[PDB]
Amino acid sequence: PQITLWKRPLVTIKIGGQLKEALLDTGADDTVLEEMNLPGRWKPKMIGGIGGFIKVRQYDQILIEICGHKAIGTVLVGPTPVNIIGRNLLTQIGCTLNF
Amino acid sequence: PQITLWKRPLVTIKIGGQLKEALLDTGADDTVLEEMNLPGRWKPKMIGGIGGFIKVRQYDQILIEICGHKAIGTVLVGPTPVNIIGRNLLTQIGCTLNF
Numbered sequence: 773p774q775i776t777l778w779k780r781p782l783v784t785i786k787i788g789g790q791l792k793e794a795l796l797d798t799g800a801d802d803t804v805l806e807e808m809n810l811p812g813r814w815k816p817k818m819i820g821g822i823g824g825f826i827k828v829r830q831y832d833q834i835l836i837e838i839c840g841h842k843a844i845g846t847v848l849v850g851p852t853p854v855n856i857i858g859r860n861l862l863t864q865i866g867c868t869l870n871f
Numbered sequence: 872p873q874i875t876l877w878k879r880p881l882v883t884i885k886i887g888g889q890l891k892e893a894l895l896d897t898g899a900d901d902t903v904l905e906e907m908n909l910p911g912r913w914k915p916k917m918i919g920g921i922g923g924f925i926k927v928r929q930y931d932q933i934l935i936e937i938c939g940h941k942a943i944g945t946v947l948v949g950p951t952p953v954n955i956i957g958r959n960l961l962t963q964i965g966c967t968l969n970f
């Protein structure tokens with residue numbers, strides 16, 4: 773698609789046979805979701821944003837589909853108000869910014 | 872231009888006649904820049920991110936060039952760690968996500 777930005781760029785994703793919604797976020801280095809039962813154990817990680825820093829759970833090798841585009845990578849679970857697809861996955865679907 | 876997302880999408884901007892570097896951020900509703908003075912009157916605002924809220928000064932109708940592309944709009948100023956161009960200005964330059 774070619775997605776204009778007059779509203780938040782929310783798209784449908786699929787993770788572990790659950791459809792969710794998430795934000796295509798070029799200002800995010802990593803991908804951050806609020807929840808899921810991603811397979812078991814996790815490693816702690818720090819991430820920062822505008823307000824300061826937060827601890828997240830890092831899960832590796834996570835299969836995710838973004839508008840039907842298959843991808844695999846690291847997904848953080850943390851206190852984000854919106855699910856965030858960051859650059860680590862945006863690159864895998866060949867997402868570019870254009871103007 | 873067409874910008875891939877293997878690294879942070881930093882671009883040259885010009886504001887108040889000075890060149891700066893800023894992150895093109897589809898995940899930002901608003902544009903937030905490092906402390907500077909701008910023309911006109913500002914009003915106080917709080918904006919939320921990962922980590923919580925910060926206080927910023929909102930300036931309206933500020934001219935900015937993003938890679939040479941003119942945009943006029945609200946710019947917030949305050950203690951951000953990175954200059955962020957958000958959707959309010961991305962839409963003015965006809966920036967789109969593509970995959």
Ligand SMILES: CC(C)[C@H](NC(=O)[C@H](C)NC(=O)OCc1ccccc1)C(=O)N[C@@H](Cc1ccccc1)[C@@H](O)[C@H](O)[C@@H](Cc1ccccc1)NC(=O)[C@@H](NC(=O)[C@H](C)NC(=O)OCc1ccccc1)C(C)C
Nearest residue numbers: 797799800801819820821822853898899900901919920921
């Ligand atoms: C989501 C994070 C992965 C991302 N951070 C990062 O990628 C970074 C730098 N990486 C990173 O942490 O790497 C690992 C690391 C960290 C530290 C040390 C060593 C290694 C990020 O916060 N990115 C933000 C920009 C930024 C970049 C660098 C440094 C500081 C800020 C926006 O892109 C971004 O996409 C959105 C994500 C988002 C959306 C909505 C809510 C919360 C977060 N956030 C924003 O912070 C923008 N907010 C919004 O557009 C508004 C207005 N917010 C909003 O709706 O807030 C509601 C809310 C707030 C709080 C609680 C509940 C609701 C802001 C830039 C204007």
Ligand SMILES: O=C(O)Cc1cc2ccccc2s1
Nearest residue numbers: 914915916917925926927928
């Ligand atoms: O004091 C200043 O110079 C600047 C600001 C104060 C304030 C208070 C609440 C919300 C935003 C802002 S900006």
